[PDB]
Amino acid sequence: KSSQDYMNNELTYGAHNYDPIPVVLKRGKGVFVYDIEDRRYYDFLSAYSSVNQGHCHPDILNAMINQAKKLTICSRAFFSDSLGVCERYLTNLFGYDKVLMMNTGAEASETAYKLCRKWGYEVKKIPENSAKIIVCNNNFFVPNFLKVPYDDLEALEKELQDPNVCAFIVEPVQGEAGVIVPSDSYFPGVASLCKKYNVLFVADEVQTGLGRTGKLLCTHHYGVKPDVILLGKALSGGHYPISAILANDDVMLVLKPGEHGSTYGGNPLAAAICVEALKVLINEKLCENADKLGAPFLQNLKEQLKDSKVVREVRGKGLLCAIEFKNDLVNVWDICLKFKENGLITRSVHDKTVRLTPPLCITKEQLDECTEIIVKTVKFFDDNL
Amino acid sequence: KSSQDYMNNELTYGAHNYDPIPVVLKRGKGVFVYDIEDRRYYDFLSAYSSVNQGHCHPDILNAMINQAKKLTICSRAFFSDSLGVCERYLTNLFGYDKVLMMNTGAEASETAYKLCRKWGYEVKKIPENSAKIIVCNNNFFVPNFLKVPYDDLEALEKELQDPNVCAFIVEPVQGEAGVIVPSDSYFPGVASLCKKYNVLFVADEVQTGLGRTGKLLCTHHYGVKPDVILLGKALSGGHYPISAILANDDVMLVLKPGEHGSTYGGNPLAAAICVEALKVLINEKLCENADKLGAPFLQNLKEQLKDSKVVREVRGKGLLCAIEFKNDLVNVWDICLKFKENGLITRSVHDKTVRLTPPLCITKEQLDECTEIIVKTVKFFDDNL
């Protein structure tokens, strides 16, 4: 069959709740994916950083098969051997007392909200049912969520005044908003306003962490250490849904042994995959590679596109990059379709921004080729407006 | 490294949000698990029906390795080949137009709420922001839910009167409430009251389906066909978090292509695992085995415990079984600890009920042994009051 047989098939038997680019993948390896007709593309989404280590990494697969032969799941009604090995590994690596393993990024957010509010009541003695969490505006009305603009220390402290605030949950760079990088001063001041007003400084590193911006934690760029870290995506090198919350004893122990719905969270298979996925990231110096290739690539891109009419701005840090377009001049869906035609696949957030986030095992020669591709694709829309 | 060592390690590095029975598993295979000290136990939880096919089923592992070598994840920004194969397979199997793949049971519930309400507004023309969902009381306050007692057709129709009701979401047997089986009349009448008042009849089969009670869908016992089915757990034979919603075009097409958050949902690896996990269930006649061994086991158990002072009731259907205890006479945690000591592991829900749900590949000789174990365990407590 053809790519078109697959797409019609999904249209008949699957819900229509997603709107994918019309490409049908059957294989991935490192920085490349391959469609039904055996065309090859650079993957510039990386499944939103799940494959920082590259597609189908053999070491991760190996750790997977090994654990899967032994035991894939017992519930949280019992202990497994693998979970605690993972927990010890992660806490030591990142320097936190404790970790809580879950499946999805959404689970990690929701559990973080609960953790923050419960620390609010137990430790900060906030009045009942009124613990407030501060989040940023465009990225991360809804009750007891106070919204402030990103990268605005003034508006933040203004909200920290409220004694009922238990936490500020924030991304080191805003992903969904279109890759918004903060001013260098911001986070050093976030750490201060938070330490000052006795507020949990929670860093959402589900996308930004694990090498994406050059470091294990993007916050390490700003030389701050958050009270609470959220991790996900690359935790598994894409082989399994895994997420985690890291925190010290004073916050984590606020959670009590309770009766929770059944889960895959903390299962033995995920635990083994997670350790190996981070070992691969580290042993292969993938954070370093992204830290080296990143800024050059971004600057070189900013240079070659400086005269483009349709480009509004090139943004990024490490290999977390994006191009924002003037959506009054071009349709961004069409830009993505053109990238695809040109051998590079990615997707647009909102109406304006295209994500540029390749697996971190990419070589400089490959990034040069991808630069050609990006320039040629933008050129097309410039030549034809 | 002793079990004790594993448990202390988890206590130091992991959150204390769960309260497991003190057994540390390192291996599972079919109906058995094995701890650090190589003791063997019958698994009578089955990770809440995730391992209906038994632990570490080699066919499922095989389908997993095969797909994992090719591609584990691209996001929903693109198409994969594997997803549509899975969707076609499931819709045909269960007889619904469409399916929507997700990761967790909780995701399936939340998505079901949105699906129901959106059908409420689009099709049933319910006024905005006021679509109401009927759930049952002990098992499944909050905005836009209406709670009725389980197995009560009167209280149900009373609530169906409200024109703003879009759906009734209900379990074929109540799990969390302690395995509550409905009167044979109930579901045939649920199907009627629902068809009559123009209300979505949504069956939550996340625990009850896929052979657990003898059939692919427990509702098949009552000869009704729900408008919407929720599936999970055994969908993957415990190798991966997978859940699904099945529904026909008139309901499913209510969800439109959108900018949804990054997901593992519908990833190629889950899709391949899911098809094979159901193939194994069906090729091995696991539904049939549970349908055969189930009632005998339950009746024989009801008989051998008829004179017990601590036992309140034996309940079940197929291999979805439970013993409720008089919590005024015994501590149910201690009962579980004693089961463990006796070679069978399980857990208690609430203060009263112990879950009895072995993998469905269990043999009659095995169930006879387990019967001895359950009787001897209950004997221990009886001999002491």
Residue A255, domain CATH: 3.40.640.10
Are residue B138 and residue B239 in the same domain, yes or no?
yes
- Nearest 5°: CA angle at A134, between A211 and A221? 25
Shared domain check, A162 and A125: yes
| Residue at a domain's end among A257, A284, A311 | A284
Residues A130, A140, single domain; the answer is yes
Contacts of A107 in chain B (CB under 8 A): 104
Domain count, chain B: 2
Rounded to an integer, what distance in angstroms lies between the CA atom of residue B76 and that of residue B144? 30
Q: For residue B326, give the CATH number of its domain.
A: 3.90.1150.10
Q: Do B56 and A75 touch (CB under 8 A)?
A: no
* DSSP-derived pairing of the beta strands A353-356 and A320-325: antiparallel
Among A265, A284, A303, the domain boundary falls at A284
Q: Give the CB-side neighbour count of residue A358, counting CA atoms within 13 A.
A: 27
A28, A62, A126, A5: which is closest to A358 by C-alpha?
A28
Rg over CA atoms, chain B:
22
A325-328 long-range contacts, CB within 8 A, separation 24+:
A325/A352, A325/A353, A325/A354, A326/A352, A327/A351, A327/A352
Collect all residues of chain A within an 8 Å Cβ-Cβ radius of residue B19: 257-259
Complete DSSP assignment for A91-120: HHHHT-SEEEEES-HHHHHHHHHHHHHHHH
Q: For residue A361, give the 3-state DSSP assignment.
A: coil
Residues in B touching A105 (Cβ below 8 Å): 261-262
CB-based contact A33 B74, cutoff 8 Å: yes
CB contact at 8 A, B98 and A9: no
* Among A residues 240-299, those touching chain B with beta carbons less than 8 Å apart: 240-241, 245, 252-253, 255-264, 266, 268-269
Asked if A252 and A291 sit in the same domain, the reply is no
B104 closest CB neighbour out of A83, A264, A268:
A264
Contact B178/A at CB under 8 A: no
Q: Which residues of B touch A100 (CB under 8 A)?
A: 14-15, 17
Q: What are the structure tokens assigned to B333, written together?
A: 């945690």
Minimal Cβ distance to A100: which of B15, B55, B269 = B15
* Burial class for B287, CB neighbours closer than 10 Å (0-12, 13-18, 19+): buried
Yes or no, beta carbons of B33 and A76 under 8 Å apart: no
Instruction: Indicate which residues of B carry an active-site annotation.
Output: 140, 204, 233
Structure-block tokens of residue B244: 């699904």
Closest chain A residue by Cα to residue B17: A257
CB contact under 8 A, B9 and A255: no
| Rounded CA separation B280/B276 (Å) | 6
Question: A181: helix, coil or strand?
Answer: coil
- Which A residues 33-62 touch B at CB under 8 Å? 33, 36, 43, 45, 47-48, 50-51, 55-56, 61
Let me know: does A203 contact A352? Beta carbons within 8 Å.
Answer: no
- State which residues form the domain around B119: 57-284
Q: Would you say A128 and A166 are in contact if contact means Cβ atoms under 8 Å apart?
A: no
Do B91 and B143 share a domain, yes or no?
yes
Domain shared by A320 and A174, yes or no: no
Method: X-ray
Subunit contact B84:A10, Cβ cutoff 8 A: yes
Residues B344, B45: Cα–Cα separation, whole Å: 10
d(C-alpha B230, C-alpha B200), whole Å: 13
| Same domain, yes or no: A191 and A320 | no
Neighbours of B89 (CB within 10 A): 18
In this structure, the answer to whether residues B312 and B263 fall within a common structural domain is no
- Shared domain check, B202 and B143: yes
B365 touches chain A (CB under 8 A): no
Give the CA distances from residue B227 to residues B66, B146, B201, B253, in Å, rounded to whole numbers and listed in that order.
Answer: 35, 19, 5, 13
CB spacing of B14 vs A84 below 8 angstroms? yes
Check whether residue B270 and residue B294 sit in a common domain: no
Report chain A residues whose CB lies below 8 A from the CB of B345: 77-78
Q: Are residues A251 and A130 in the same domain?
A: yes
Q: Do A51 and B65 touch (CB under 8 A)?
A: no
Out of B231, B258, B284, pick the residue that ends a domain: B284
Catalytic residues of A, by residue number, are 140, 204, 233
Planar angle of CA A87, A88, A89, nearest 5 degrees: 90
Closest partner residue to B238 (CB to CB) among A56, A72, A77 is: A72
Does residue B125 contact residue B261 with C-beta atoms inside 8 Å?
no
Q: Are residues B294 and B339 in the same domain?
A: yes
Alpha-carbon dihedral angle through residues A267, A272, A276, A279, given to the nearest 10 degrees: 80
Asked if residues A354 and A336 have their Cβ atoms less than 8 Å apart, the reply is: yes
Nearest alpha carbon to residue A26 among B81, B63, B67, B274: B81
